[PDB]
């Protein structure tokens, strides 16, 4: 089973600044990585698919890059509404797995 390491656990940043959360795979998973955002007491919300493909309804502020073992979710100018938990999840190999998660902090 694949391991999705997400460190740091928390990330401090100031308004409008650019933030980037890191997610590492225990082995090449290509581009089969997807991002989810979860706000306090919310349900997860698909943010990005296949590491760099955008989803409709998601701020153009949200972007992603990476391939193989090192992937990056990026917010280009943070802001209050962005405060949440961010998780990565691979579907390269069965069974799917989730990242330990990373908390945004403005």
């Amino acid at each position: 089973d694949i391991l999705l390491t997400q460190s740091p656990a928390i990330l401090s940043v100031s308004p409008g600044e650019r933030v980037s959360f890191s997610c590492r795979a225990s082995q090449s998973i290509g581009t089969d990585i997807h991002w989810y955002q979860q706000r306090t007491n919310g349900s997860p919300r698909l943010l990005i698919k296949y590491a760099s493909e955008s989803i409709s309804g998601i701020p153009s502020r949200f972007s992603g890059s990476g391939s193989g073992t090192d992937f990056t979710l990026s917010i280009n100018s943070v802001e209050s509404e962005d405060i949440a938990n961010y998780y990565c999840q691979q579907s390269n190999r069965w069974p799917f797995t989730f990242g330990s998660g990373t908390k945004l902090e403005i």
């Binding site: 390269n92 069965w94 069974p95």
Partner: protein, 103 residues
């Protein structure tokens, strides 16, 4: 119409059906097998196309017994078919040759 043409004709449609059900069943067979990659329809379909055409880069392959079974069927349908087009292409030539031979 000309049998060998209906054949090649059929042959193609049928293959397309095997390719699809192949992709579908493959995913079904593979999911559940740790480390398996043949697990999402889209690639599973490209898996089947490279397999029928007998290329198969090894980018993806079944690791379960049922997954493989599907592989054997996709493989066999893939081969058989193209070989049928060939066969049919031969009847065509052999026939038009006679004609040019005034017979």
């Amino acid at each position: 119409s000309a049998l060998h043409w209906r054949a090649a004709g059929a042959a193609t449609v049928l293959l397309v059906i095997v390719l699809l059900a192949g992709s579908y069943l493959a995913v079904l067979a593979e999911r559940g097998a740790p480390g398996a990659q043949l697990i999402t329809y889209p690639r599973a379909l490209w898996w089947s196309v490279e397999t029928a055409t007998t290329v198969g880069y090894g980018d993806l392959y079944p690791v379960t017994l049922w997954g493989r079974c599907v592989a054997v069927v996709v493989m066999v349908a893939g081969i058989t078919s193209f070989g049928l087009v060939t066969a049919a292409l031969a009847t065509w030539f052999v026939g038009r040759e006679q004609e040019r031979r005034g017979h």
